[PDB]
């Protein structure tokens, strides 16, 4: 078939403590924000904390697998 | 109380011109008053001041200072020019006051 190492590595990195914790905080935010009908809150921050930790991890491995 | 002496002795040492072998008076900026005073200094006092200064410039260029045993001591610093300089300023003020009169 065909598999982008970016997918592989991203999944591996999401197993990381930092990502797991960040991911956790995001799901919590998402849940409460999605459940209300009159709130200004948004989960950009948690999403960023997550993406930031994940992607920092990806950066170290990703190019090792690219040509 | 002798608070000045405490302070003035600390400053003198902090200043550090004594590390070059210079007296306090050797370091004065030569403005008009000082220039005049210097001309009134006795030959020997003048030649001595010159050596101390040349020597210090040689130290300054070499980036060295004098051995600690040669540093001038606060209480042995000679105010050789201060008396002259004061007369010089006094005279000047007299002329100034008089020329307004």
């Amino acid at each position: 078939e065909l598999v982008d190492p970016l997918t592989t590595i991203r999944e591996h990195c999401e197993q990381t403590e930092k990502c797991v914790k960040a991911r956790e905080r995001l799901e919590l935010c998402d849940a409460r924000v999605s459940s209300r009908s009159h709130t200004e809150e948004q989960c950009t921050e948690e999403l960023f904390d997550f993406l930031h930790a994940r992607d920092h991890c990806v950066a170290h491995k990703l190019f090792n697998k690219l040509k | 109380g002798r608070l000045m002496d405490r302070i003035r002795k600390w400053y003198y040492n902090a200043a550090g011109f004594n590390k070059y072998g210079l007296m306090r008076d050797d370091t004065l900026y030569e403005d008009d008053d000082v220039k005049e005073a210097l001309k009134r200094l006795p030959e020997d006092l003048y030649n001595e001041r010159m050596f101390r200064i040349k020597r210090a410039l040689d130290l300054s260029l070499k980036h060295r200072i004098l051995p600690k045993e040669q540093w001038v001591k606060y209480e042995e610093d000679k105010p050789y020019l201060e008396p002259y300089l004061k007369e010089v300023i006094r005279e000047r003020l007299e002329r100034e006051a008089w020329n307004k009169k």
Partner: protein, 241 residues
């Protein structure tokens, strides 16, 4: 409000002070620009001749140029006509003017890419993160119609739909066309497009460093040599007494 996510630093093979560009990667990256990005992005400052002896041979470059029809003239009747490209021609603009461009992209203007890696903080690190970083908006955030969520783009709502995906094209050198592989190449290409002198600049820097090390040393000695006279000079005060 002013929440922003900054891209990580990827270990590009041309990031080192003496690291040239990977030309195989630049060649590939070109194909990505040619077959994907050029549909909406212009590259006004690069001509087909710039490719020669860099990523393509002269024969190839000429071919590439002839694939394009360019306007020329006026002829004898004062008429404009079409002709096949020449290596001296610059890459074709997708649109006649930004107005048309926006008009074909929902009011959004795809920027020229000749200096894009230098016109954006983060350079290729930012272009790479944006190309591979699309995702759904976080809770509480809604993207207006026509825009797409991208955490890397300021404001996070970009007017460019994800341009690349796996096998969206086939590298004629057999490299596995994965999304990230593609982004990594086109980004490398963009670095070159922005500073074609990249390599030569670094070779010069090398020599600069060597000559400088040497010369600085020799001059240091000579200064010390001449000044030794004063540095070791001694003096004494012998008044008559």
């Amino acid at each position: 409000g002013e929440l922003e996510l900054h891209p990580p630093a990827f270990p590009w093979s041309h990031g080192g002070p003496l690291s040239a560009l990977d030309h195989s990667s630049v060649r590939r990256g070109f194909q990505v620009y040619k077959q994907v990005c050029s549909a909406c992005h212009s590259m006004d400052y690069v001509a087909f001749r710039n490719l020669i002896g860099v990523t393509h041979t002269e024969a190839e470059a000429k071919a590439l140029a002839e694939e394009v029809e360019v306007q020329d003239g006026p002829d004898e009747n004062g008429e404009l006509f079409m002709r096949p490209g020449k290596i001296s021609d610059y890459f074709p603009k997708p649109y006649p003017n930004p107005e048309a461009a926006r008009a074909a992209n929902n009011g959004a203007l795809p920027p020229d890419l000749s200096y894009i890696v230098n016109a954006r903080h983060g350079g290729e690190d930012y272009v790479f993160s944006l190309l591979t970083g699309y995702c759904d908006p976080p809770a509480g955030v809604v993207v207006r119609e026509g825009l797409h969520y991208n955490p890397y783009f300021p404001g996070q709502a970009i007017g460019m739909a994800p341009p690349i995906y796996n096998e969206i094209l086939e590298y004629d050198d057999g490299t596995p066309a994965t999304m990230s592989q593609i982004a990594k190449d086109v980004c490398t290409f963009l670095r070159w497009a922005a500073e074609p002198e990249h390599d030569q600049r670094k070779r010069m820097g090398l020599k600069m460093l060597l000559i400088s090390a040497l010369l600085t040393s020799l001059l240091y000695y000579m200064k010390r040599h001449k000044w030794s006279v004063l540095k070791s000079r001694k003096m004494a005060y012998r008044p008559p007494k």
